[PDB]
Curated annotation (Swiss-Prot):
Name of the protein in question: Type II methyltransferase M.RsrI
Gene that specifies this protein: rsrIM
Catalytic activity annotation: a 2'-deoxyadenosine in DNA + S-adenosyl-L-methionine = an N(6)-methyl-2'-deoxyadenosine in DNA + S-adenosyl-L-homocysteine + H(+)
Regulation: Strongly inhibited by N-ethylmaleimide, inactivated by MgCl(2) or MgSO(4).
EC class: transferase
EC number(s) from the headed UniProt entry: 2.1.1.72
Temperature dependence as stated in the record: Optimum temperature is 37 degrees Celsius. It has about 60% activity at 30 degrees Celsius, the optimal growth temperature for this bacteria.
Keyword annotations of the record: DNA-binding, Methyltransferase, Restriction system, S-adenosyl-L-methionine, Transferase
One protein family per Pfam: N6_N4_Mtase
pH dependence (record): Optimum pH is 7.5.
Amino acid sequence: GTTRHVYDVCDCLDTLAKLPDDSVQLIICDPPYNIMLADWDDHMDYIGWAKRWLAEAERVLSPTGSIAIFGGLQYQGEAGSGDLISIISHMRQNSKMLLANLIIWNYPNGMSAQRFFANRHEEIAWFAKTKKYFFDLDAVREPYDEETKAAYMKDKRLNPESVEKGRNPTNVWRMSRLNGNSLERVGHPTQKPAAVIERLVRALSHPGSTVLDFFAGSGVTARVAIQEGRNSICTDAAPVFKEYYQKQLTFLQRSYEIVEGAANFGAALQR
Ligand SMILES: Nc1ncnc2c1ncn2[C@@H]1O[C@H](C[C@@H](N)CC[C@H](N)C(=O)O)[C@@H](O)[C@H]1O
Ligand SMILES: [Cl-]
Ligand SMILES: [Cl-]
């Protein structure tokens, strides 16, 4: 099964406007949480701008599709900025999508703090377009060691199948962020680790389906999509994105094709 991956440098709304209704299965969304100076010509707050791509994201998702939105809960009230709560509140008022889960990404290390509890978490809001969203839990279950699995297998009160399939990873993920000495590092300041994206891709999309990322950043989504047998469309407004994408590809070096240019999005939409 050969997959196709398209990438390009452009604004998220320009990408979305080029995608047809219900054509995407999963969207990875790790958006900037502040608007640009020029954005003050048409908006009075962050959501004023964000609601545009949020509405479009929903439009391009298929009936069984989902969108995972990364964000924090530390917004301080600055004009033009916001956080995951700004988005969730907007979604509750204006979207029919369902909040299937609020995932806590609990990372091991971080900065210290003397006047408050040191921050060790970031959130992921998983929104499903409808109640018929796709979910592959078995694909992300965590297996028990042979010792524990044996102990449970003897407990007649427990379902043997559930035991062998492994445990639900829960909505709290203890995963490390990338460090400056990380191998998959490409130079992007807010680069996300492949491990977190793999879990979302494996559980929220089916093989051969399209994964879209319009705030692609380091291009980690394409690398994960290729490795996992999915098709992908990754775009970012920064020209340096093309540099990161090509860097992600070297980490791979399986049948897949890479295509540059928004005019070629269709190559990755074909099922
Ligand atoms: N209008 C836009 N269209 C497409 N990409 C954008 C736009 N504005 C910003 N970006 C890109 O989106 C990414 C935002 C990330 N830094 C977001 C990480 C994280 N949510 C944070 O803000 O800390 C970057 O790679 C930006 O180049
Ligand atoms: Cl939840
Ligand atoms: Cl990234």
